Design a protein around this ligand. Structure first.
Ligand SMILES: Nc1ncnc2c1ncn2[C@@H]1O[C@H](COP(=O)(O)OP(=O)(O)OP(=O)(O)O)[C@@H](O)[C@H]1O
Length: 529
RNA sequence: GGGGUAUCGCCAAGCGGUAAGGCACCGGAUUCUGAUUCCGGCAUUCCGAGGUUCGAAUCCUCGUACCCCAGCCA
């Protein structure tokens, strides 16, 4: 429960409503991100919890920032998260003729006029945060004059910026938004839904309350930066002939540590080619997180955990990562892969090899087992061998023995270094009566596989509050390795988490993998204590 | 000027009856993954100072900090 659900509860009890109807209304000017997932979880979650309805409405009022690519991706992401909207997909543009009729009602009532103060002047006349504004000299035109001028705007008789329609409210209001807000502005831009039918487009505040009202939304849930705007939400609905009056309730937006959510900013990273694209695995976008190997359920859980309050907040990446590790630990089948490999030859070995039976899940016998090959010339991870180290080090030191994963207890004996002091191969012996643990991959049957180790995109926790967020990009956000994996990984499918033992959870990258050369993105590392 | 918020390192519950829970962190047991699982510890204190009350995080003052609003963006 959260403050919003307590309100809905009151509403139902008091008999103010019988059904609850919410809506998720993104503008199609970019791809959805983890922050939006919190609105999706909130809006669609309430609908299903209260057996209500939730609309997916594209708030498409500004054509010069929107594109059809975004509408199809947004729908994709909403479904992938595991949610379904009520009825057909809606668009604010579906209501352009409606919105235009309402503007006329406002004009007819003398509550709206066509102003001609230039874009620079409207700012000058608006006042400041402590000084009231002043009336445009075009404020007292007659209704008859406004109808004429407005139809002229509609007919394309005015150049962009040359005229706009404003609400006649109060230039001295302490609410900056009630200072004669613009309802319509001229944009000769083709719209992704309505083509060139319109050259005048409605503003967010005029469009939002009216759309909610027409869809019979009972509770509009938005983020905190809209509390000031609520005054205009109610003023519009109170002054036009509409039979219902939805109520707006604001919650705090999600800020994630080490990442920027601003679409304006996320678009800079994509536009300037600093990430592969909106769905690059380092992006905090839904599609990015999906490609990274995140599961829709891990995200739904993440929203469940962070809560819904009116408090500004900043969640640590640790919280997100906790969610995904938990999901994958449960459902991810284990496998073996070596990221940085140094060759290890067992001298004592006899034969072209053998076959060990490894479990697909160490703590869940039910998941099955597999027959993995073994031999003398295997592949091991560099960081697992040490010529010398204290008692703490529980891996392969040049003296003692260590158990291979589901195999033999080998024993370090001799090292053969390259010219530059760097080791090239390690020589050891094994006890055959056996079958300090490490993973390995029989060089004989090793599958060459490219690994992509992702790390946080920014090097500061709040790249948002930086003079230039780009200059604070982490150069080690993506470190590409070439390694080897057991041949079973030959049958992996894009977006199927595997837990490379003692490393982390990894998944096949659809964008880069091929037949011989698979590419694995590292979703998340293990709790490396 | 106006509109909001203040409870653990990060989130968060609490609604006059004596500070849940999660992440992180520290131990300790188990483990052929330095994972997982288990065990236990982690707010005498709720922005501060006064006051009301048998009892206040919660009520009433009076301060303080932070966030939002001056797009013909959403
Ligand atoms: N960080 C966030 N946390 C929570 N909810 C968010 C967040 N960002 C956006 N939303 C929610 O998603 C809804 C749709 O957002 P929309 O795409 O219209 O704008 P935006 O993404 O906030 O802005 P921009 O496109 O400039 O980044 C908003 O109604 C809002 O409540």
């Amino acid at each position: 429960t959260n403050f919003i659900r307590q309100i809905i509860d009151e509403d139902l009890a008091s008999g103010k409503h019988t059904t609850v109807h919410t809506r998720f209304p993104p503008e199609p000017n970019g791809y959805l991100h983890i922050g939006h997932a919190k609105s999706i979880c909130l809006n669609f979650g309430i609908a299903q919890d209260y057996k209500g309805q939730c609309n997916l409405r594209f708030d498409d009022t500004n054509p010069v920032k929107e594109d059809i690519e975004y509408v199809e991706s947004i729908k994709n992401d909403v479904e992938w998260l595991g949610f379904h909207w009520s009825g057909n997909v809606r668009y604010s543009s579906d209501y352009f003729d409606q919105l235009h009729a309402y503007a006329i009602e406002l004009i007819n009532k003398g509550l709206a006029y066509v102003d001609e103060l230039t874009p620079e002047q409207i700012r000058e006349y608006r006042g400041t945060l402590t000084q009231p504004g002043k009336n445009s000299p075009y404020r007292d035109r007659s209704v008859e004059e406004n109808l004429a001028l407005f139809e002229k705007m509609r007919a394309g008789g005015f150049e962009e910026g040359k005229a706009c329609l404003r609400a006649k409210i109060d230039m001295a209001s302490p609410f900056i938004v009630m200072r004669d807000p613009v309802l319509y502005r001229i944009k000769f831009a083709e719209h992704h839904q309505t083509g060139n039918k319109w050259c005048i487009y409605p503003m967010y505040d005029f469009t939002h309350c009216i759309s909610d009202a027409l869809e019979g939304i009972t509770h509009s849930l938005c983020t905190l930066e809209f509390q000031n705007n609520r005054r205009l939400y109610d003023w519009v609905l109170d002054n036009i002939t509409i039979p219902v009056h939805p109520r707006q309730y604001e919650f705090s937006r999600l800020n994630l540590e080490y990442t920027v959510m601003s679409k304006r900013k996320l678009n800079l990273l994509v536009t300037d080619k600093h990430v592969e694209g909106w769905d690059d695995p380092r992006m905090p976008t839904i599609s990015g997180l999906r490609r990274r190997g995140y599961t829709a359920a891990s995200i739904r859980e993440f929203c469940k955990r962070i809560g819904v309050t009116k408090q500004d907040n900043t969640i640590e990446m640790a919280s997100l990562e906790s969610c995904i590790r938990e999901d994958l630990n449960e459902n991810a089948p284990r496998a073996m892969a070596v990221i940085d490999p140094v060759k290890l030859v067992i001298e004592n070995y006899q034969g072209e090899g053998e076959m060990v039976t490894m479990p697909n899940h160490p703590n869940k016998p039910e998941m099955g087992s597999r027959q993995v090959p073994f031999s003398g010339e295997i592949w091991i991870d560099r960081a697992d061998f040490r010529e010398e180290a204290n008692k703490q080090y529980k891996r392969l030191v040049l003296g003692k023995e260590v158990r291979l994963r589901n195999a033999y207890v080998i024993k370090a004996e001799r090292v053969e270094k390259d010219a530059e002091g760097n080791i090239t191969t390690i020589f050891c012996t094994y006890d055959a009566d056996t079958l300090g643990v490490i993973h390995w991959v029989s060089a004989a049957h090793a599958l060459p596989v490219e690994i992509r180790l992702y790390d946080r995109l920014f090097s500061v926790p709040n790249p948002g509050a930086a003079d230039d967020f780009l200059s604070v990009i982490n150069p080690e956000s993506l470190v590409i390795k070439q390694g080897f994996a057991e041949p079973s990984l030959k049958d992996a499918v894009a977006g199927k988490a595997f837990q490379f033992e003692r490393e982390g959870y990894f998944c096949l990258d659809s964008r880069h993998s091929t037949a011989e050369k698979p590419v694995f993105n590292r979703t998340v590392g293990l709790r490396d204590t």
